[PDB]
Amino acid sequence: AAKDVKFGNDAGVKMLRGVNVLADAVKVTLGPKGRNVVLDKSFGAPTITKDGVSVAREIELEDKFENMGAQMVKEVASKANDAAGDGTTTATVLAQAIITEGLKAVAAGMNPMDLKRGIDKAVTVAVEELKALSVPCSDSKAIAQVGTISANSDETVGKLIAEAMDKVGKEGVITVEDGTGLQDELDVVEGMQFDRGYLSPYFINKPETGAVELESPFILLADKKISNIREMLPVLEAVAKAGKPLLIIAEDVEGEALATLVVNTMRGIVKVAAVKAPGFGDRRKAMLQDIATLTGGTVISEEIGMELEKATLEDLGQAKRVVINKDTTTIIDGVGEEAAIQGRVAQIRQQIEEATSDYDREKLQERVAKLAGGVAVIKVGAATEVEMKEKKARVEDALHATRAAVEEGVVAGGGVALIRVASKLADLRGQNEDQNVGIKVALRAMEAPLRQIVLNCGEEPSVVANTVKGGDGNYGYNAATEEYGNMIDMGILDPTKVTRSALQYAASVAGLMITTECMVTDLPK
Amino acid sequence: AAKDVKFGNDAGVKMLRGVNVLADAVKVTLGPKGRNVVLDKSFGAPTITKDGVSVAREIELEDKFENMGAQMVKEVASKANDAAGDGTTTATVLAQAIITEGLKAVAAGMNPMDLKRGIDKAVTVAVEELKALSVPCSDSKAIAQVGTISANSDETVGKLIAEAMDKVGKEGVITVEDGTGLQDELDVVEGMQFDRGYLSPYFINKPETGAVELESPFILLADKKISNIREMLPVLEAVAKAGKPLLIIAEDVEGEALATLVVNTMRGIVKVAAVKAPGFGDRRKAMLQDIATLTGGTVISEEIGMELEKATLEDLGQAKRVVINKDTTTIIDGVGEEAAIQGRVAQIRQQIEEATSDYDREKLQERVAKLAGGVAVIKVGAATEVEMKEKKARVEDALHATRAAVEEGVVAGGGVALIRVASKLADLRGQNEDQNVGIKVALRAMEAPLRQIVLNCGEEPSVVANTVKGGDGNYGYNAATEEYGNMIDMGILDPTKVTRSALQYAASVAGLMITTECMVTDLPK
Amino acid sequence: AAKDVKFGNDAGVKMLRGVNVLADAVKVTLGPKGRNVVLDKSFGAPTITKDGVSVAREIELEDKFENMGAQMVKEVASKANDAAGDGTTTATVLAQAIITEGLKAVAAGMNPMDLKRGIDKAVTVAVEELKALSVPCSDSKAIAQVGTISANSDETVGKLIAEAMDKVGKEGVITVEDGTGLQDELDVVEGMQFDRGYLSPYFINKPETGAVELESPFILLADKKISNIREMLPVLEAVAKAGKPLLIIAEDVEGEALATLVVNTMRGIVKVAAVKAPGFGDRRKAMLQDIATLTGGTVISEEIGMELEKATLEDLGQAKRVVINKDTTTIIDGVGEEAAIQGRVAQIRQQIEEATSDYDREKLQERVAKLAGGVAVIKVGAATEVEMKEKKARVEDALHATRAAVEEGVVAGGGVALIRVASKLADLRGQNEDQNVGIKVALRAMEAPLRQIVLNCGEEPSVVANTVKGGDGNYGYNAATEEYGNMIDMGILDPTKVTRSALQYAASVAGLMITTECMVTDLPK
Ligand SMILES: Nc1ncnc2c1ncn2[C@@H]1O[C@H](COP(=O)(O)OP(=O)(O)OP(=O)(O)O)[C@@H](O)[C@H]1O
Ligand SMILES: Nc1ncnc2c1ncn2[C@@H]1O[C@H](COP(=O)(O)OP(=O)(O)OP(=O)(O)O)[C@@H](O)[C@H]1O
Ligand SMILES: Nc1ncnc2c1ncn2[C@@H]1O[C@H](COP(=O)(O)OP(=O)(O)OP(=O)(O)O)[C@@H](O)[C@H]1O
Ligand SMILES: [K+]
Ligand SMILES: [K+]
Ligand SMILES: [K+]
Ligand SMILES: [Mg+2]
Ligand SMILES: [Mg+2]
Ligand SMILES: [Mg+2]
């Protein structure tokens, strides 16, 4: 259709207005004193939230160009979310800060490309510096603290997460479900859990959790790669009857075969999901067997001259339920008999005795623990369905944040880490003045998170910012108590990963907008 | 419906306005300092590009007449693209330059036909002169340089392309696919690859790549032309069963038979694709056999009194996958047994020994290399899906440009080649004054590319243009470093083919517009 | 619906405005210096043409009455086109000239009927006078010249046409197809070709060429007229099987039978086309046999007591392909065996020996030549698909014009023939003054073609017209070189047939408009 086309400044003011509406709506929810945002619903009462992502999803503007600016920066939160699962609001205020000053510099006549280069250089060095300052979240105490902090100071949620990770390990699978009513519940189910997700989406039958769930399915344990569907045809049909879904746990399911499975299960033609076998090399085969012993199946390896074509429903393993995430497979309640299973345990138990290497020893103990990984399930307390659904949300977020914290060290929260980094880069320079302005734009935007947190408290941003910059190290402002102190000692930490991600995605989208010269959209008609 | 009709000047100003909107939007993306253009999307964030073609595709104007002018010049980029696969932006700025001055001359009262004749004469001589200045891109170093330059100075992409061409030859087939994650991968697959594309589109089942892809298909190796479908009927039905696609590799598939295949495979009635046999004359038969030995098929030649009717699925060859472009067929992983294949190699290996001619020797070595051409596959590095998808784009373009460079010599880039050519034509004259003005219009437009590249840098076009014209030879302006020097020594080259194409298509469309007296379009209703 | 009704002058000015828009758009394309007209397309770039018919097809006006005038005169071009296949633009400028002055005379109070009578008388005498001046286009040199002139001075196209007519005779069938690429190709295919077209349209399966094309069809050779479908029923069903089309070559297919064939083949119920047998009388039977010997069929004549009912697929002849125009049937590649065919040739070859009459001798040689007419196929050169498609158009038009030239003598081109004729009619008078004005209107309009050709050159119409009228004979203005001279010696000729047709259709439609008193059209609602 006929288009409306805008250039330079005309386009810039439109974009800026669009990012401001989005960022302003989102940033009021930042930190312990975040404010509420009410989102209208077509039916019933409006939604009241302090969740940034929830607000962003609702933002769409009337002016086509302003809407483009809003949808562009909205990409910042979504990418930061996909990558770290937290810090989307932080990423959004960093982006607004960089875009605002960057566009001002452009309007002033500065070279957009140089501005972007300067911003990029500052971010590159800032990230290195962020790593240098990064400390860990390994022990259960740290995990508890981060969990508590991520749960709005709810020490309860903190303990839960810590206990759940103590059961299945901090790398294990953990889920949260509605509670039976009052008092939380934590139980490990099959069963076993290993680090391997679906070999492709679509298998996802429950987009609510973005996971795949199968009930009383058959489990094919093939010790090899599967490229040709032909091999599956015989077993797939055997499973076609008995009306039960099939879980493929092979060394890997490549294009040809995988593509077919995706299409067939897409047409209701037999429900089948595929995931890679745990581990690699030798231990892979040994582990693929542990699953067999657990599900009562039989490994189909070519090493013993076995063919998938010559595989009956008797070779297949089976369990009451199996769940698979983007990167986790959990088999709940397997058919395997305690005789075989417990016997398998005894075997591996001796393996540990004959262990001549710590590495081999560790790997073996990992198997016995799993067989004797599973899935830790957290059932949220209650006392009224409303509160129960709420606490469930908090536990979910706290878990998500703590998981991120465990993966990559931690740094002082409350926006102080970025402020310390910015101060260390005061002498950073580029190839020219415009690049230097870009560097300064980035260092200035690095104070935005702390300033917005303070602003949401009802305090003065410049005063608090000035005071924090005055000290050093982990010295920061505790917005919950409105007292200065050592952020680490007060338990206010952020996973280095979310801080880094927030900054990189903010600078990335900001750089693109700053170097945008023209915009095209449908004519308002 | 009722039409709006415009004549002369009224039509001219409309056309000019339409080409200006398109050219201005496109030309800002020219060269190393090209600016970004933001293209609106109905959903999500806007597209940000420095790619001229991407911008042109989005240009459509409200005023019916202006839109006609935009769509007309848009033909310049598309034809230059189809012919050389690069230089569409260059072609667009040349067209705008020729159209602008040409229409001004017309408004001044000059004869349109003479103006066009003059422009044509200048372009004819300019092309001859361009050939005279043309130098080569034969060795891997040159290929690497061009690749690097086409990849925005990414020496990585440069090395990749150079290595890929070193594997399958600079005339061989090369593809790029998403990487497994971090670090690039280069592997040659079946298999073999020969220079023959689909005998007609439609066979193209994947318009994304504009190629045809078949999985585990049967390969009919007929040593003769196929005109009558009757001959195929028996084999086509044999292939109808077993549910596998068919690849026809005959001496040629003419109208009657071809037309049927296009219609049938068009109705899902058996998937079949046809391509000519590699080479011609004697070597053709020998090569058609190499394919047989590779795919485990049997050549059906009339020389041995064989009929296609009397051909079973046992005579047909077979491979896990085959891909065919506009002019390349690649058979990946053939059923042929290493015994037969490796034996065939030994045969041809002796052929080379008994070779009494270099030509026959070269041709034989070509066969052994292919059997012992295939398809080089480039898997782009990664480190996040976003960057991976981006680098993939660059490798694709760099490859496309380097391929063009390899085909036809090279000339100084940065728009200097056309400037040198223009200076050599200062004394060119026509049959009259109007023809002389046309010649001058063309020589003036030849400076436009260098001027726009400089303008995009933020420098002064006239000053740089003046300085480059001041020197001679490969003396030019390096827009990346903003330093003058020897364009060739700095590695800034353009395939003579893209420069020539850009100029000819620009002059061609410009000539048509300049000689347009009337425009007809639907009434804005 | 409610109508708008206009009378006399009100209607006249509307008509005149409508013919002026159409004629003005069309006439700029007249002659060697014709200008371009740009025609808008709903998708892609506009069409740029110098072809009058192409422009006329696009002309439709908003004002209902003006549109009526445009559509009426548009009938001039279309009829001239159908009758001579050239001179549509010439016919259009003659019509505008006659209509313009004629309507002015009417407005002045002159009797419309007398004006029309005068115009008619002038045209009647002018045509006689045109015949008197008419010279021939018989030898290949003349054919080459006309072809070159009709191909915009492209001596290449001229040679092609000349060679094609040298192969199949100037009365033979000639077609043009896309070339294989670079360099033209001329080959005679079956086969044989005779002067007989489809016995009715509808059989036309390819409206693009307005011809009928059959592949591997059966050929019924009945030596008699076919009125009753009953006779065909048995053979039609035999042909229903084997899934092959049928070509009926009988003495003639009359109403009843023909009507059925048209209806059945109209419903996909068996594809059958019918054409009369070549020649008449005795030679007819002999010729019908030559076709049999060529297609391997059997003539079904009642003379030998044969019935169509008792005719099997074995009696029917057969060929790989057959094409039939409005007045030409060409059988390509017949099944007949070279033994029978070459033997038949020997027979007729002796016939020529025993020939006691030149007439019988000529007729026999015609048969041997055909059997030892066919269809000459011209494959246009190339060097890029665009240029190839263009040159193909030129060859098509040049062929069409040359064919017309060959049929009926030639006269000086460049509009001089009509000017010479007009000068010879200076003393022509009618029954009254109004009739005399009508005569003058017609003689004045006869200068219009030369004047428009000159005007398109950018020269002065009155000066050139005055100078040409000053000399005599073939003295004219060469618009290509802008030099006066002998039109015939310069090779600028027009078939007398197209000039005559252009004038008669122009005067015919003009006469109708001039005698129109009232117009009725739907109310603009
Ligand atoms: N007591 C506190 N004092 C100061 N800052 C705190 C305190 N508790 C938490 N924070 C900080 O608040 C920030 C996180 O706030 P919040 O969860 O509202 O936004 P986000 O994580 O950036 O985005 P999302 O909407 O995805 O949660 C981090 O900088 C965190 O360290
Ligand atoms: N360092 C450089 N200095 C000057 N010119 C350069 C430099 N590097 C590349 N170029 C030139 O830039 C031009 C190519 O730019 P670009 O790829 O943006 O446009 P294009 O090829 O004309 O069209 P497309 O949009 O199809 O790519 C060529 O003239 C090339 O030689
Ligand atoms: N060198 C020439 N000088 C003068 N007149 C020429 C010359 N070459 C061709 N002509 C004339 O130009 C006329 C034909 O022009 P043109 O083909 O443009 O129009 P047309 O045949 O009247 O209509 P159509 O659009 O059907 O072709 C004829 O009168 C022909 O003799
Ligand atoms: K919040
Ligand atoms: K570019
Ligand atoms: K013309
Ligand atoms: Mg958070
Ligand atoms: Mg390019
Ligand atoms: Mg003509």
From Swiss-Prot, chains A, B, C:
* Enzyme superclass (EC): isomerase
A GO cellular-component term linked to this record: cytoplasm
Where located?
Cytoplasm
Binding of ATP, residues: 29-32, 50, 86-90, 414, 478-480, 494
Keywords (alphabetical) are: ATP-binding, Chaperone, Cytoplasm, Isomerase, Nucleotide-binding
**InterPro entries tied to this protein:** Chaperonin_Cpn60_CS, Cpn60/GroEL, Cpn60/GroEL/TCP-1, GroEL-like_apical_dom_sf, GROEL-like_equatorial_sf, TCP-1-like_intermed_sf
Q: Which domain of life is it from?
A: Bacteria
Report the record's Gene Ontology biological process terms. protein refolding
Q: Which reaction does it catalyse?
A: ATP + H2O + a folded polypeptide = ADP + phosphate + an unfolded polypeptide
Q: Report the EC code(s) recorded for this entry.
A: 5.6.1.7
Give a GO molecular function annotation for the protein.
ATP-dependent protein folding chaperone
* CDD domains per UniProt: GroEL (cd03344)
Q: Which PANTHER family match?
A: 60 KDA HEAT SHOCK PROTEIN, MITOCHONDRIAL (PTHR45633)
Self-association or partners: how does it assemble?
A: Forms a cylinder of 14 subunits composed of two heptameric rings stacked back-to-back. Interacts with the co-chaperonin GroES.
Annotated NCBIfam families: GroEL, PRK00013.1, PRK12849.1, PRK12850.1, PRK12851.1
Function (record text): Together with its co-chaperonin GroES, plays an essential role in assisting protein folding. The GroEL-GroES system forms a nano-cage that allows encapsulation of the non-native substrate proteins and provides a physical environment optimized to promote and accelerate protein folding.
Q: Which family does it belong to?
A: Belongs to the chaperonin (HSP60) family.
This chain belongs to the protein called Chaperonin GroEL
Origin organism of this chain? Escherichia coli O157:H7
